[PDB]
């Protein structure tokens, strides 16, 4: 409703760097808000893509941002009559970014890994990896829970049980208020998907450079399965956290699995022990139901609600014809211990191939009426196909069926305006929560400032 579409702020990274592929707000130890920006194809030292991260100080004029530096050198360790190897080329550092406290977590889902023992090997595979930084102090740490030292032959004998070689950890990421990092790894367990959790504090305290393979005892990983319903389900393609069991001491996980059950798709709610509390099945195969998930209480009852995006949903139209437009589902949490029922509201895109629902950002309470609101991206929507971000306001009965405001992309075609979103943070300290929108195709980020309601 009251985002300002006239005076935007533009940040920009290097050409081709995909600057803005991922972003988040970051607050330093003094509460000063900045913007962490992921640029997963930024060039490294060897003039090869390795990805990069940028920490953008707030400025109404925007402009260039300083780098948040990470080690981009490939590593090798000869230990235990084996040879450990990391490969950072095309690893895609900044394919996801998230801030918690005064710490930044930037991941490279496609960082590769291999272990050599004489003539045998573990195989060179994308275990993924996350880099952690405390910008003020300069502290650095890493977390790569899927790295193993088991040789290829062994996995074959045991029929590829507990095979974490293609995890792509960090593909998605989130951090609980308590400071537990939760990584989505859609390729875990031979492409079933897994989740890796570990306290940020313990990551830092247990990490030392050069070790490459080390234990994080307080970590917790999800489980493998022989149920074919999970096969090629990419469980962890997206991830979020919230309160869904009524016990405020426990933190529940929300996991997207957009190809679950032969591409039906699913989203599951779990306790911190990865035990399943609910499952939402997709409505239409190949819609990618679970591509994006969002948790926020939209109807002001203090119970977290669930939004799910299916960006490839094909709406039914006259003459038995289907039209790919994308869809968003709203699930309101019922009072007390009860299952999430059917969706309370269906929001469906309008522009063909628009991919409405590709991203869903809680905005907090934008217009300050007591109800939290959301923004939905259609990265190729709008009459021009350039992209659109639509705002839907909370209300007592859920969300409004029509948007209160539409943001047309200011960038050229192919920018992917809206592919990444982040809201619910007041960056200019004016008392209204603001929205940052990534457009990695244009290597830029747009900042929309909320203003008093007119």
């Amino acid at each position: 409703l009251n985002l300002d579409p006239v005076q935007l702020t533009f940040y920009a990274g290097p050409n081709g760097s995909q600057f803005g592929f991922s972003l988040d707000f970051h607050k330093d130890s003094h509460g000063r808000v900045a913007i962490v920006v992921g640029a997963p194809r930024t060039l490294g030292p060897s003039q090869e893509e390795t990805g990069g991260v940028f920490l953008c100080p707030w400025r109404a004029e925007g402009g260039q941002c300083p780098s948040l530096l990470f080690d981009l050198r490939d590593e090798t360790r000869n230990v235990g009559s084996q040879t450990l190897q990391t490969f950072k080329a095309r690893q895609g550092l900044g394919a996801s970014v998230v801030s918690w406290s005064d710490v930044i977590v930037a991941c490279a889902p496609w960082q590769h890994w291999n272990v050599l023992e004489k003539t045998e090997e573990a195989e060179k595979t994308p275990v993924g990896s996350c880099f952690l930084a405390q910008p003020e102090s300069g502290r650095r740490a890493e977390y790569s829970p899927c790295r193993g030292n088991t040789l290829s032959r062994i996995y074959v004998e045991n029929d590829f049980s507990w095979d974490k070689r293609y995890c792509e950890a960090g593909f998605s990421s989130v951090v609980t208020q308590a400071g537990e990092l939760v990584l989505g790894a859609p390729g875990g367990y031979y492409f079933l998907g897994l989740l890796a959790q570990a306290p940020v504090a313990d990551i830092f305290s247990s990490y030392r450079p050069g070790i490459l393979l080390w234990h994080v005892s307080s970590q917790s990983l999800s489980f493998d399965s022989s149920n074919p319903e999970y096969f090629d389900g990419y469980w962890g393609y997206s991830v979020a956290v919230g309160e869904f069991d009524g016990d405020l001491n426990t933190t529940e996980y929300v996991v997207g699995a957009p190809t679950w059950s032969w591409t039906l798709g699913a989203v599951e709610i779990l306790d911190s022990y990865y035990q399943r509390l609910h499952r939402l099945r997709g409505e239409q195969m190949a819609s990618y139901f679970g591509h994006s998930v969002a948790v926020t209480d939209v109807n002001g009852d203090g119970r977290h609600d669930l939004l799910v995006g299916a960006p490839l949903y094909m709406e039914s139209r006259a003459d038995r014809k289907l039209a790919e437009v994308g869809r968003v589902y709203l699930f309101l949490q019922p009072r007390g211990p009860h299952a999430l029922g059917a969706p309370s509201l269906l929001l469906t895109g309008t522009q063909l191939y628009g991919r409405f629902g590709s991203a869903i950002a809680p905005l907090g309470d934008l217009d300050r009426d007591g109800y939290n609101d959301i923004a939905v991206a259609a990265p190729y929507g709008g009459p021009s196909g350039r992209g659109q971000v639509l705002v839907f306001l909370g209300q007592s009965e859920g969300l409004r069926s029509r948007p209160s405001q539409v943001l047309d992309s200011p960038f050229p075609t192919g920018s992917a305006f809206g592919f990444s979103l982040r809201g619910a943070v007041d960056i200019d300290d004016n008392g209204y929560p603001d929205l940052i929108v990534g457009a990695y195709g244009a290597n830029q980020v747009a900042v929309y400032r909320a203003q008093p309601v007119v």
Partner: antibody
């Protein structure tokens, strides 16, 4: 807190066999490698082998191939070291070891199990 | 196998002294070395891992260093409890092998 609680001292005869145990306290045995080390006053410290209790795969110093047999039961959260065809030279103190962070390190040690072979 | 030559076999020193134990390998092990402490008539305690990294709970007066095939353990300002046996151990290759050992004794 991490503690490795081994069995009590053994007093056996030559030619017989014995099975030492290493119970994990404050953690799951399945988390890391478990090694076994032999200590004698003259010969000093010697690495026997290791096991990965998660899957049961083991490695041995070829000097102990035959006598030493390392096993593990995740149920009782314990690792074992079996010695066979015992000799006067098998008279030693036996420690079970695990790493702290580094996968390959030797950081946490049990109190040690004394073994004496005699007729 | 990798031979670990630890020197000296023993040293007579006093409280507050800064002493250094060395450990020479038969080949490069690239800091894949650990240091251990065994107090008289007791079990072992990890001091250092990967050449220079302190085990959790170890005082900072302890410190490891070196590279290639030559490494050192240093104890600044000896404490009354530091008088004990010390061993190095490499894990660059299986089988793991240990140093001869070094005993810190009270001088008089």
């Amino acid at each position: 807190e991490v503690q490795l609680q081994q069995s009590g001292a053994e007093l056996v005869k030559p030619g017989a066999s014995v099975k030492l145990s290493c119970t994990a306290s404050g953690f799951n045995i399945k988390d890391t490698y478990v090694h076994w080390v032999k200590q004698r006053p003259e010969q000093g410290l010697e690495w026997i082998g290791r096991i990965d209790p998660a899957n049961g795969y083991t490695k041995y110093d070829p000097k102990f191939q035959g006598k030493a047999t390392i096993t593990a039961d995740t149920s009782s959260n314990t690792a074992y070291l079996q010695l066979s065809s015992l000799t006067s030279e098998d008279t030693a103190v036996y420690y079970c070891v695990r790493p702290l962070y580094d996968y390959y390190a030797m950081d946490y040690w049990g109190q040690g199990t004394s073994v004496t072979v005699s007729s | 196998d990798i031979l670990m030559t630890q020197s000296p076999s023993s040293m007579s020193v006093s409280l507050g002294d800064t002493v250094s134990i060395t450990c020479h390998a038969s080949q490069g092990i690239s800091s894949n070395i650990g240091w251990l402490q065994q107090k008289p008539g007791k079990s072992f305690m990890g001091l250092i891992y990967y050449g220079t990294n302190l085990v959790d709970g170890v005082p900072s007066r302890f410190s490891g260093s070196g590279s290639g095939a030559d490494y050192s353990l240093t104890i600044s300002s000896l404490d009354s409890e530091d008088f004990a046996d010390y061993y190095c151990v490499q894990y660059a290759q299986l089988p793991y092998t240990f140093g001869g050992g070094t005993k810190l004794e009270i001088k008089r």
